[PDB]
Amino acid sequence: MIIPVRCFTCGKIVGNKWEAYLGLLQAEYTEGDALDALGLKRYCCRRMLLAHVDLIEKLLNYAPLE
């Protein structure tokens, strides 16, 4: 739905890296290089940014009921 705050396994903060991850990918980085640049060494943390599907961007297409 949205990027989780913590890494599920180890508890490292990941929610403050989704926009930076996408920005690095727009800079023509391999996904491994992007995750290494963000400093995610344990594959538990890397799994979360590598496999996250951001549906909130799609949910924001619908107008709010206010």
Residues in contact with other proteins by the rule CB under 8 A? 1-7, 9-13, 15-20, 42, 44, 56-57, 59-60, 62-66
Whose CB is nearest to Zn ion?
A: 7
Binds Zn ion by CB under 5 A, chosen from 1, 2, 5, 10: 10
Instruction: Extract the annotated binding site for Zn(2+).
Output: 7, 10, 44-45
Q: Hey, which residues does 54 pair with through a beta bridge?
A: none
Buried b / exposed e across 15-46, counting CB within 10 Å, b at 16+?
eebbeebeebeeeebeeeebbeebebeeeebb
Residues near Zn ion, by CB under 5 A: 7, 9-10, 12, 42, 44-45
